[PDB]
């Protein structure tokens, strides 16, 4: 009858829960990387909507037969690609409570709980991160934090804030002279955000890094680029320093970076999308030292903090700049020192995201969360040791968190006393391409690659919530079998 | 043990299904608009995270005692504020499946099903809307559609596409001469997009509208604006025409607006966030006549299409512009298909096509039409109830399922004098009092609008749980509070 019948809700919801419990019980059974051909689904499904209803049972049969073959199982214990899609029972339950309530929190009045819980919970997490008080919500009133969907949106919001702060002082006609700084390892979330914000594409500086800094941004290189831009009559605006780059999880030195930036009034945003969460543990916190000298800081709680997709956390030292850049107060939504979160982000409508984070924190506790992260790190260390037992491979850059970067060495295919050169390195790159593709095609595990300084290398990024030690051991076994077979 | 243990997952998920089923069974009892004081919740929760774990039973108890009181119940059958937060069992189940797979679909490779099902379902819905083929996916590989979070994101995307397509021709130094046209009813989501995209604030025209066109944008006003801007040496760029404005669900006339725009190469985006869904019914398709002469089209399926929050559908005639303005080619995501990362803002995508797929499959075209028609019918009934009471008037015509009404000036002025500014101000104050009294009762919730100076009350009916009796009881509450204010 009604699409929100409570009893039908109970029934079908129980059905879907059983379905997902089965899926988690069975996921290790599928090939990690989808093995379908492009366009398979367009062929297997109808071309128009149904006129009459269809049973939920039918739709679930179709989910099993048609959808799942087309999934890359990010939550498989044998998923090691990109960065983890960190999920959890608590995260799922928080998402489902938010979707059940289905409220729209664009201002305080549309649901006081959404806004106030988000404030409380961001303070919680930021305190766990031991962020400086200048970034948290002061009860005596400055700083503050907000939940957004993605890192790209957080960078876009802080970039727009910086842009408007500067152009209000010097005049919009300088918009095409504004310069954004990052490293050549910096995630594309930055150049996309710069494009959308109207920064001229000639003024996004991907500063060159090298093995001498383990591909972190050199402060001397940043200062040279800044001085060149000043000499050309341009306007330095924004630096995006990164903790845990996508390629090799390199780590930028935030302290000296901000020290250079303050010399020129540059806004500094800290992209710690993946690695940020590890900083709740005392032994990892040093990676974000100097954050106190930066202007904004973000992490992706869905990459390594079990929330489920999606939940990016953005803390700012000067929330008024966010608000001023993004604010619009029409009359339909005006109908007191409250927070209107629509003025902190892109979207007007907002999802009750604080629920996921709240439920994760409460269900597991700081101790168990730290244990989870340390489990991932210990598994990565174990993988690196296994590699250390095979002189055919090397570690290309130091393991900073739970990602290991490795490759077959040149001496694994060139049995000669010849000095390295470009051709030898290219052929080594080729055999590593071949090895990774063979492994992925097996379907037993899934890893992605990255090129740093011309060296092509394989990333083992362990963090899937279901992963256990045996999956690490088995993954190494698979790499070794495919190595043996490729090298005869 | 494991934070994703399947047994514990099954147990706590069943518990949560039951908790939410009880919520829907009992939601009618809470005051619709939240009644808590600002700062209420901080007082009740700890100021730091817990070091030890906490039972899900305890968390659920805290949700009942601490969270729900701070909710404004968008899904109460007596909620008629803003526009509906339209949901359904099917949408909830689609979101469940999405979150349970928890896959990121920035690549096709990162989960072909996400990408392909999104394309298929956008075709389905565009076909139900009778969108021109120029807006849908060619089976042979022209146009196409993408799911997103909000209408603001859709407008930001199309505006970025138009901006970059223009500046690629004339040079980025002209960014400060690009003009964006809208009506003075146009949702602020457009002004925000213009600010973000670098459009100069002096160059967003909020063209004035009057009761003469029921506050729809007039082609002659738009053309005067565009000509004046051309005379100033500015560069007209982008028009946002709205079908179903927030304030009074006015309807800009897409046809002649596009005819004016095409004379100047202006990109036309059709914002149909709320009313767009209604066009899956034949009798409503006329509201988007001339969409074929436009450049992009969007609606919010979470407003009037039962998907759950959130889902905004955006179609375009030229996806190449979208991709060329939003494209990035990075080395970390490679080793002919759609890569939707180049169609929207973020790299990460939610498996959003599952919500829409489940809604369409679970209900059907016929039943969805009947749902929307029921909302429209309840709105007609509320309008007739108003008609039975000569203290009230209908300020503008009902286009969809929202009725805009007010206490007439003759309800508070016995005098037989010609209307003037003071009388209208006092009538506004009376209607303010009426709306705030109604809303503070907690029994129902409506929001206000101001069109051409006149302050009026919106009855926007479309919550999934609303029945005829809720409409009737809403009118009873309005009349009781009116008598209490007058006699
Ligand atoms: C014409 C138009 N465009 C856009 C929007 C909203 O754009 P976003 O996707 O960025 O949110 C609205 C509704 N605006 C109201 C009403 C509303 C009602 C229900 C919802 O689920 C969402 C919004 C509001 O957001 O305040 C609108 O009427
Ligand atoms: N953004 C990540 C992919 C990713 C996103 C979200 C996740 O939860 C996990 C991984 C990348 O570029 O590699």
Curated annotation (Swiss-Prot), chain A:
What processes in GO biological process is this protein linked to? Answer: amino acid metabolic process; carboxylic acid metabolic process
Q: Does the keyword Methyltransferase apply?
A: no
The UniProt gene name for this protein comes to: TYDC
**Enzyme class, broadest EC rank:** lyase
Tell me which domain of life the UniProt entry assigns to the organism this sequence originates from: Eukaryota
Reported impact of residue 152 to S: No effect on catalytic activity
Keywords for this protein: Decarboxylase, Lyase, Pyridoxal phosphate
CDD domains linked to this entry:
DOPA_deC_like
Q: Does the keyword Lyase apply?
A: yes
- Cite the GO molecular-function annotations of the record: pyridoxal phosphate binding; tyrosine decarboxylase activity
Tissue/organ expression = Mainly expressed in roots, stems and capsule walls.
Question: Might you report a single GO cellular component term?
Answer: cytoplasm
Mutation: residue 301 to P; reported impact is: No effect on catalytic activity
Q: Which cofactor does it need?
A: pyridoxal 5'-phosphate
**What are the EC numbers?**
4.1.1.25
Q: What is this protein called?
A: Tyrosine decarboxylase
Q: Which organism is it from?
A: Papaver somniferum
UniProtKB/Swiss-Prot annotation, chain B:
Tissue-wise expression: Mainly expressed in roots, stems and capsule walls.
Q: Name one GO cellular component term.
A: cytoplasm
Q: Which UniProt keywords apply?
A: Decarboxylase, Lyase, Pyridoxal phosphate
SUPFAM superfamilies in the record: PLP-dependent transferases
Please tell me, according to the UniProt entry, what happens when changing residue 301 to P. Answer: No effect on catalytic activity
One GO biological process from the UniProt record?
A: amino acid metabolic process
Query: Keyword Lyase on this protein?
Result: yes
The protein's annotated catalytic reaction(s) are:
L-tyrosine + H(+) = tyramine + CO2
The entry marks the following residues as binding L-tyrosine, namely: 84, 187, 302, 332
Enzyme Commission number(s): 4.1.1.25
Biotechnology: applications noted: Yeast engineered to express TYDC mutant Y350F together with Pseudomonas putida DDC (PpDDC), Beta vulgaris L-tyrosine hydroxylase (BvTyH) and Papaver somniferum (S)-norcoclaurine synthase (PsNCS) accumulates (S)-norcoclaurine, an important precursor for the production of benzylisoquinoline alkaloids (BIA).
What is its cofactor?
pyridoxal 5'-phosphate
Q: Which Pfam families match?
A: Pyridoxal_deC
Write one Gene Ontology MF term. tyrosine decarboxylase activity
Q: Which positions carry N6-(pyridoxal phosphate)lysine?
A: 303
Entries under InterPro entries matching the protein = Aromatic_deC, PyrdxlP-dep_de-COase, PyrdxlP-dep_Trfase, PyrdxlP-dep_Trfase_major, PyrdxlP-dep_Trfase_small, Pyridoxal-P_BS
Q: Which domain of life is it from?
A: Eukaryota
Question: What Gene3D superfamilies does this protein's entry cite?
Answer: Aspartate Aminotransferase, domain 1, dopa decarboxylase, N-terminal domain, Type I PLP-dependent aspartate aminotransferase-like (Major domain)
Q: In UniProt terms, what function does this protein have?
A: Tyrosine decarboxylase that converts tyrosine into tyramine, a precursor of isoquinoline alkaloids and various amides.
> What protein family is recorded?
Belongs to the group II decarboxylase family.
Instruction: Describe its partners and assembly state.
Output: Homodimer.
User: Which protein is depicted?
Assistant: Tyrosine decarboxylase
Highest classification ranks of the organism: Eukaryota, Viridiplantae, Streptophyta, Embryophyta, Tracheophyta
Tell me the gene name: TYDC
């Amino acid at each position: 009858q009604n699409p929100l019948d409570p009893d039908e809700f109970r029934r079908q919801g129980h059905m879907i829960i059983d379905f997902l419990a089965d899926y988690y019980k069975n996921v290790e059974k599928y090939p990690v990387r989808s093995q379908v051909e492009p366009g398979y689904l367009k062929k297997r499904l109808p071309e128009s909507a149904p006129y009459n209803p269809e049973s939920i049972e039918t739709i679930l049969e179709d989910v099993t037969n048609d959808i799942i073959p087309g999934l890359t199982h990010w939550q498989s214990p044998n998923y090691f690609a990109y960065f983890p899609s960190s999920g959890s029972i608590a995260g799922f339950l928080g998402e489902m409570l938010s979707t059940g309530f289905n409220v729209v929190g664009f201002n305080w009045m549309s649901s006081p709980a959404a806004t106030e819980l988000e404030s409380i919970v961001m303070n919680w997490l930021g305190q766990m991160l031991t962020l400086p008080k200048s970034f948290l919500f002061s009860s005596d009133g400055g700083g503050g934090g907000v939940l957004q969907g993605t890192t790209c949106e957080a960078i876009l919001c802080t970039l727009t804030a910086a842009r408007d702060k500067m152009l209000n002082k010097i005049g919009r006609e300088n918009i095409n002279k504004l310069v954004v700084y990052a490293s050549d390892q910096t995630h594309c979330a930055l150049q996309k955000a710069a494009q959308i914000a109207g920064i001229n594409p000639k003024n996004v500086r991907a500063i060159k890094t090298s093995k001498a800094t383990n591909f972190g941004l050199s402060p001397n290189s940043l200062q040279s680029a800044i001085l060149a831009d000043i000499e050309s009559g341009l306007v330095p605006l924004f630096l995006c320093a990164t903790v845990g780059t996508t390629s090799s999880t390199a780590v930028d030195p935030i302290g000296p970076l901000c020290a250079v930036a303050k010399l020129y009034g540059i806004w500094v945003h800290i992209d710690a999308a993946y690695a940020g969460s590890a900083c709740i543990c005392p032994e990892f916190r040093h990676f974000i030292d100097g954050v106190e000298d930066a202007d904004s800081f973000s992490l992706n709680a869905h990459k390594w903090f079990f929330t489920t997709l999606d939940c990016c956390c953005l803390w700012v030292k000067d929330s008024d700049s966010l608000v001023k850049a993004l604010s619009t107060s029409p009359e339909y939504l005006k109908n007191k020192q409250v927070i209107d979160y629509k003025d902190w982000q892109i979207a007007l409508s907002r999802r009750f995201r604080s629920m996921k984070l709240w439920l994760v924190l409460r269900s597991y506790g700081v101790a168990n969360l730290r244990t989870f992260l340390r489990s991932h790190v210990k598994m990565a260390k174990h993988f690196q040791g296994l590699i250390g037992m095979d002189n055919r491979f090397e570690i290309v850059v130091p393991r900073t968190f739970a990602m290991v970067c490795f490759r077959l060495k040149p001496t694994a295919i060139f049995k000669q006393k010849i000095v390295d050169n470009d051709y030898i390195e290219d052929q080594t790159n080729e055999v590593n391409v071949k090895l990774l593709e063979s492994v992925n095609a097996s379907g037993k595990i899934y890893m992605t690659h990255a090129v740093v300084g011309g060296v092509y290398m394989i990333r083992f990024a362990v963090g899937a919530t279901l992963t256990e030690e045996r999956h690490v051991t088995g993954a190494w076994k698979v790499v070794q079998e495919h190595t043996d077979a490729i090298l005869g």
